[PDB]
């Protein structure tokens, strides 16, 4: 006799993170809203708008290189990556049939904030009657840079740069030579494979350097376009209704590895251009997440009864000996058999080219 | 024996907002067209044509800050956010069985009118010759700024600015330090959670501060794209055809609280430059919305059974008190228990990090 | 025992309007294909191609303002609205059970002609080699404006204006001033929804003032896009093989009132430049339609048994008594009671805020 | 107990087109792969790279008008269209049950070939750095025309102009002037549905007079796309994959009439800049087609019994005799009776405006 | 009572190319993961940074042409192909029922890396404010270049060129003159069906000669897209999520021929300037491919008991004898019968025209 309104799922509990702390159930949906700031430079921790006008969201500078052969960027001019780990729950586990649950990034909803700040056209940037000075404040132009990173493990990172003679800053930055400890090749300047990383710091690795590995992120979703130039106008579309897919060809998604979920980004915008010179301070504009996770039962990767090997292993001491492993490996070959074939006339046949 | 025409919905009766006060019945389909007229800089009120030229529809100027550190935008150059409230009749309640009906935003055609008038190319703008001052009067270009929104309740935004030294007036404009009474800090200009506002006065929130909030509208759905640039050409598309589905995931749409039907806009199209000097008024257009909405049940959100705690909150003081919320409050902790759960061992287990 | 090619339509008859003179049938579909011819500027009067060059397709020239405050667009300067009425035959009725057949708009092909036209880079334009007078003549370049709409009645209008102290001509030229016998207001600057028009003339609505209104063609499908700049490069597609749908939410599409057909047009393409001066003439390029229509049985609107009314009404002189409609109507209230409701209690309640 | 491999289509023969003359059966399908050379201004015959440079593939230069008055293009500078016939063999007839055999055109895989072709930056064109004459030859650039068709019978051009006061040459071009044997009149700068013409010679009909009819070419796909601009960057998309559906609303697509299939192109990519002067050659690049045809069941046209109408008008003298047909047809009025109505009242009633 | 994990592909074992000597079964898939890099310029063999910077991904400078007639473009300034071949294991065969396995390309997932590296605005680039040499370093600019292809066999090139009068080193560099012993002719500037190579060599076919051959590849897939001019900003999109289908219209894609999978690619971004002067290196990033293969059953194609005619063919002589193949053939006619048809008339008729 009454109207029935229509079903919609219905909402537990909301609030912070502390409302992860209730124990749902396995088909419950969580969605967690959350925020990164741009690492461009200038870091956040001097408050005061007068060191030199609180360049939090801008660079600090830039300085061009004296000659071919010496280049320092001076680490307040770098952009660099984003990243932010949440720590979710512990979920159930199945020790008996080998089997665990964890958390399933299912679905994103990401939007770049605050795009209207470029109107504004006053300011004491370049004029565009430079003649008389006088216009308006040219607003932020340039390269732009938009890349942002789902996933269940630090955004795994591969090293490129243009000139490779480029002397960075030997702390509070992390470059190929922080990782392989030699100098930077010529082969750093088109694919290295040994010029790897992860994306653990945030402010710390430079977004020139360091690029989404094609070969390696399999439980991260990462999605970048760039747009070069010295006045490309900037183009953003920000909208409330938009969602991402985050589930892949088997129709998974990133689980989370332990129980961490990692938000990568890095959001450039162009350049602001002051009025004494031509300093070219960058711009960058917070980016905005909301992911959708689930509970997913998986196999249980460790056989944790290798607590046991790990018992032998933390008694046994630490051996040297001689290299089985690496490039002079004194292994000569391994061979496995498991079954009975047919005795084989040459058993040494292959790919003949 | 004879033809049957083919099936359409029966416009009861049309004409202004009186005829929603015709009681229809359950199935019904009402279509609202409104339009809002651009709040960029100049108001409405001096409708007399020779003060500086009417700039209603543009901006009074723009004024270059006069060093790094003050800067003062001068309230009738900063285009604002343009909203409407349209008021609906109330519907059916179900005070027995507790349910209410309330109007749901189903779809919306919207379209940015007059944009053949740039191709106004007679005029006092700066020429395309400027050594001779003659070819065309320059139309206008440079950065374009589109943002609409249709909910049930005011637009939520979010405060981000360019520098944060920028002394807007305090009246006649309500910026970040309008809502937060102190000043604005450097986190101002990245993503401050506490620069929070809504959409509630028209011509009054400029788009250079207040972006839609990306965390909040839940309510209401929102359409925006930004591109930069000082020359970058103007494109619009007009069309009879085309309309936009305000349902989200569930297949709601928003829900009209109280009744009021919320509808914001901005929409920026570039410049135009004047001749003795580069002055830079801006230029906006008017938007037209079509919103098409139905009838909803839906579970009543307030037990108005609560007027009887509202009694009781009424006639009791307003105490202070010591505090017990915020962030010194003095709750030390609260529990909650339903059933009976078997013993557990150590009560205090959490995510193990 | 013979192959059986595919069926296809079946064609009666082609040639021209003469056709339609041929009483077909209820499941008969007509393709009519016309094209419309630039009304921009220069009348198509004068075929000698010695008064001033035939500007026939383009405009006269351009005549910036002479000051802030006095501006004469000299009519043959304006671009201007295209279009045609096609006049169909009269179709079936059915009095006895009221019903009437109309005609019904169901497809449009529609094509801008003559794109490679602007391939002629010999002729007197201003070179690109501005110090030498070298190079090419440059080609059309600029503000782009496309617009075209099929109805069944004529496309209503909307006036938006830049500059509103613009003063145009009173003869050979509708503008604002025109409809509304007043001056234009600010108001006009923005939106005024008195400022409407529909488009009956050809060549003498101006495309900078009136604009196709999106609150009212219902019988019509209009469809454009503006691309603002002054070196804009300009961007057709023709092709042979896309159509496009007039058919509405109902699948009902545009039906003919009376029994014409309506063809509304503008294809802007650009400025060229003189040399001597900067003179602009506008280039427009002429548009093929190719409408497919259909019979529909409808639901005839007029009683004209009204006929009796119209004998009541011309015999009953001309009075003008009190107003009893407008704004100083003298009407107090009007109520309808149809049926029969319980007794109210206030019988007088509404929207309560 | 053997694998079975997929089926795919079975290839009798391939070769030149010496192979269609093979009677393969009803369901047999032919591709054809062939291509189209850019007949852009200097003719391929003078095989000697030393003339001037041997243009073949651009312009041979461009000169400017003398005044607004004279204008002369010098045939070698205007690009026309390229155009080619392949001719298929003869295929089944049914002059006992009244129907025909043909070729049809079922899809069409096309490609501009050479765009890396336009990397070539060194050469002796105009610098980058004008002032020292260094940097890079500037590559292609400007106006960029895209046109393919593919039909049963020649592409159906309409003609359209700028200036009609431009004087071609009278032989090796195929202008207006040369079908209607008079001048160009300014109607030809707008839309004269009497400037048709079609594409049966190549490089002999530019294609900044001739433009596909979109009013006449039904039995011909063309597809094309214009950019305009002086320094517009070339963009292009080749591709092995992708492939044109050539069939129409019906599902037949283009039959080839007798039993040719004609492909039409134009592909000019921008200008080349010289370096003493500002000369301004054309490039273009040559379009390969793979036409992908079946046989089709059809219905004779042709009721060849009309030989004995031949007849008779072979034996029958050519009289000239008074106007029966045109525009001074001395015919009154032409009337077909075929049953019987019931008798009319007035029986001339019409479309009554 | 346990739960269940959801159903994934198995992986049997992952590593190098090693892990393909596991013979695994007829529906396993592999899945392989390489990169290319830029062969553009500068060789890779010169490691130390000092000779002239290791311009290993540039190349080494740019040499305008002398004179109109004499261009030579110094080897290392040529952007050219990229090439790999992977070799795969052999597979099974079934001499008895002629049959035979081989590799399917089904998938790829392509990637340009490192367009982050063009955010290097420090450096010894030619600056923004060239009258101060301030501001930024000029990032890459100009015409991109973007070509990919995964086939069975070595991509098919075609010959076509600028000016055929450059004279290209005869060593180092594979151009037209070394495939076609002599010299270039006009034809080659729009196309010559003689101009026809194949892509073995890696880091030799500059692709301003080499372009992909649309009528010959038949086993190859390629991608490939063109942006002119000289300051177009790069555009560049990486994804994790996306690949394309190999599979053509029988729904087959690559074979492997031999074993061997071909991967081809170039990607040019754009140009760098020097200060001093304009030099004008080009850049070009690395590409990743992860190519997703199967098997498939296929009919054998060799009937290797022609070994028996290759027994023939070895043990008789090389005879020289008199033309029966190429254009002075002395076969008249070949003429071929099978069957019996009823006795034609006149045997000789065709396609009559």
Redesign the interface.
Known sequence: ??????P??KLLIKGGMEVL?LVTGPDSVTEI?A?L??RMGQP?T????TEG??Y???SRG????T???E?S?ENN?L?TWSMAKL????LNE?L??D?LQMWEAVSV?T?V????????????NK???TV??????????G?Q?H?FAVGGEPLDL?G???????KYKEEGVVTIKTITKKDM???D???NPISKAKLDKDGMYP??????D??K?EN??????????????????????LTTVLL?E???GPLCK??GLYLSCVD????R?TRN??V?HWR???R?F?ITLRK????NPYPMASLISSLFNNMLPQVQGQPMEGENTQVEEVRVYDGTEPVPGDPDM????
Chains 1, 2, 3, 4, 5 share one sequence.
């Open positions: 006799a009454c109207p029935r309104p229509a919609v799922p702390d809203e925020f700031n741009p956040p001097p408050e005061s708008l006008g609180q939090y969201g801008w830039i300085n061009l290189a000659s071919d052969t280049d960027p001019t952009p720590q979710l729950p512990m199945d008996t049939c089997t909803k939007e904030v605050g795009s209207g700040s470029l109107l504004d056209v006053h300011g004491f004029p565009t009657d008389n000075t006088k216009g308006i404040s040219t607003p932020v132009e390269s840079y890349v591969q490129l740069v243009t000139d490779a003679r480029t090749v010529n082969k300047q088109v694919l977004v020139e350097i360091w690029h989404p094609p070969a992120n991260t979703r990462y999605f970048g376009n760039y747009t070069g130039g010295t006045t490309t106008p900037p183009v953003l579309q920000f909208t409330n209704t892949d088997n129709g998974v332990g129980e450039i915008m162009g350049w251009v010179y031509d070219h960058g504009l917070p905005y909301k997913r039962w998986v196999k292959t790919r003949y080219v």
